[PDB]
Amino acid sequence: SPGIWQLDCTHLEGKVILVAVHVASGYIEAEVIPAETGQETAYFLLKLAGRWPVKTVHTDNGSNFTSTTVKAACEWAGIKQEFGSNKELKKIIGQVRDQAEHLKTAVQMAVFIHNKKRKGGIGGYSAGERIVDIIAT
Amino acid sequence: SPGIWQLDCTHLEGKVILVAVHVASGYIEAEVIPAETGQETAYFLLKLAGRWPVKTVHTDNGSNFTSTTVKAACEWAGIKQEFGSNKELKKIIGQVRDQAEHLKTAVQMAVFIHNKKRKGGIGGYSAGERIVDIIAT
Ligand SMILES: Cc1ccc2oc(C#Cc3cccc(C(=O)O)c3)c(CC(=O)O)c2c1
Ligand SMILES: Cc1ccc2oc(C#Cc3cccc(C(=O)O)c3)c(CC(=O)O)c2c1
C-alpha cells in the first residue's frame, strides 16, 4: 500500500542508525541518534509523516511499544504501529566513510546513493522515483 | 522547474530555523540548528537532495557562499547555489507550541500541517501532494 513503512535499527562505530524503508519502493530515510531513545524515534517519525503518507509502521520487536512519546507521535500524526537485507547501506557507508568527518554524513551519503541509483546500475526507476510514482497514483 | 528550492533562516526562542521551500509546490522542510553553522546547512542540504530532486538552491544573502562544507555538499550532490511570507509557519508554531516540550518538535508539527493541509481548508492539493505531482511529471 502507499503508506506502509518498516522501521529497524542498525549499529556502526558504537552509534545507532534509525532506518525507515517504504516497503513498496525500497526508498529509505535514516538518522544517527545519540542513544536508542523514544523521543528521537518519535521525532524521526513525525518528520517522516510530514514528508510522505505514513499510515502503518511495522517493527520486529517490543522497543517501540514501550515509549510514551512514540505513542503520542503515532496518535498526533495518525500512524498505526503494527508488530511484524537493506544493509547494503553499510557497504555504501564504507565506500564513502572517508569522504566525511562524521558518521551521520556518511549515512546520508549512503541514503542519497541508495535512493538515487538504478537497480543493477542501468534503466527504469530508482527507489526515490518509485516512491513519488507510487504516491502520485 | 522541478528541482528549484529557496533556502532562508528564521528565529524563535533564541534558536535558528533552517527552511527549504520547493518554490513551485510550497512544500517545506525545516530544522532547528544549534547555531547558524555551515556544517549543519551542508548536512540539511545533503538530506534534502537525497529525498527530492534539488538542482538549484536560491538564497538572499552571502552567508551560504562562505562555508567550505556547504560548497563541498553542493558539489557532492550536484546542487547549484544561486544568489537571489512563508512565516505563517510561526503562526502554526504558536498553535502547537504547548503540545510539545521542544521547539524542534513544534517546528516539525508546523511543517507537517503546512505540507498536509489544503489551501483555505478545502479542495485540490496540499503542498506535499503538489511536490510529488510535479516530480511524477
Ligand atoms: C507528539 C509528539 C510527536 C513527536 C515528538 O518528537 C519529540 C522529540 C524529540 C527530540 C529529538 C532529538 C533530541 C532531543 C533532545 O532534547 O536532545 C529531543 C517529542 C517530545 C516533545 O517535544 O514534547 C514529540 C511529540
Ligand atoms: C560533502 C559533505 C556533504 C554534507 C555534509 O554534512 C556535514 C555535516 C555535519 C553536521 C551536522 C550536525 C551536527 C554536527 C556536529 O558535529 O555536531 C555536524 C559534512 C561534514 C563532514 O562530515 O565531513 C558534509 C560534507
TrEMBL record, chains A, B:
Domain called Integrase catalytic: residue spans: 1-135
Top-rank taxon: Viruses
Localization per Swiss-Prot or TrEMBL: Host cell membrane; Host cytoplasm; Host nucleus; Virion
UniProt-recorded name of the protein: Gag-Pol polyprotein
Naturally occurring in which organism (per UniProt): Human immunodeficiency virus type 1
Part of the full-length chain shown: 57 to 206 of 288
